[PDB]
């Protein structure tokens, strides 16, 4: 395997070079908002982000070593977690707003246009504000996003050697995060604490995804917002 031979610095540069681009929305400022229109813009946006996410996942160290069936399952379980942490990341410098796209910046007042969507909006905001207080770095973010990809579906799959390889890569990413924090001047006590703080946030990202996933069920059944063929397939993988 190549991923296991990589140094921490090589891991970071590989992860940074594989960053997907920040796509634009079809949002028209002159046009007025409806629950169907806003969710349609978000659904159109996420459906395009998924294509880049799929090709970004191929670039994550160790991901191609996995069987194809495990690649499907990892992405099927983690796709909304990854969309959400990317959303939260690019929203750091915008307090009280979620930057879904450079042309789609929303506050929680506009998130109330969708029923029940206000509660998850506040959690994303709190997560984004939390990244601000921590001064989260881009090198730490790409580690966290890769951890989600490999971790969120590993305990829900007789060759169990697939999980050992995943845990070895996960351990390598932990080594990477620590290496980054040590360069920033943090003491060993500060390194462990920050490391714990970062990974605890992933627990909240799992919670937001689960909640968001069940909200996407309702819109599917409600049928007011059409869902793309790819998102429908990613959806019923959870339900």
């Amino acid at each position: 395997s190549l991923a296991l031979s990589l140094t921490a610095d090589q891991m970071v540069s590989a992860l940074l070079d594989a960053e997907p681009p920040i796509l634009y929305s079809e949002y028209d400022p002159t046009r007025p908002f409806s629950e169907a229109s806003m969710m349609g813009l978000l659904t159109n946006l996420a459906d395009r982000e998924l294509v880049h996410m799929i090709n970004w996942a191929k670039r994550v160290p160790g991901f191609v070593d996995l069987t194809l069936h495990d690649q499907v399952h990892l992405l099927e379980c983690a796709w909304l977690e990854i969309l959400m942490i990317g959303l939260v990341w690019r929203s750091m410098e915008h307090p009280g707003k979620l930057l879904f796209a450079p042309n789609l910046l929303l506050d929680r007042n506009q998130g109330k246009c969708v029923e029940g969507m206000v509660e998850i909006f506040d959690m994303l905001l709190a997560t984004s504000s939390r990244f601000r207080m921590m001064n989260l770095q881009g090198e730490e973010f790409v580690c966290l996003k890769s951890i989600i990809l490999l971790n969120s579906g590993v305990y829900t799959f007789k060759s169990l050697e697939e999980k050992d390889h995943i845990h070895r890569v996960l351990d390598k990413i932990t080594d990477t995060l620590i290496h980054l924090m040590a360069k920033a001047g943090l003491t060993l006590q500060q390194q462990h604490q920050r490391l714990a703080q970062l990974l605890l946030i992933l627990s909240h990202i799992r919670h937001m995804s689960n909640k968001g996933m069940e909200h996407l069920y309702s819109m599917k059944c409600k049928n007011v917002v059409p869902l793309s063929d790819l998102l429908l397939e990613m959806l019923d993988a959870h339900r």
């Binding site: 799929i54 194809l68 499907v72 790819l230």
Partner: peptide
């Protein structure tokens, strides 16, 4: 058969 399995498989 899935779109996801297809896109992952493309080379």
């Amino acid at each position: 058969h899935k779109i996801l399995h297809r896109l992952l498989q493309d080379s």
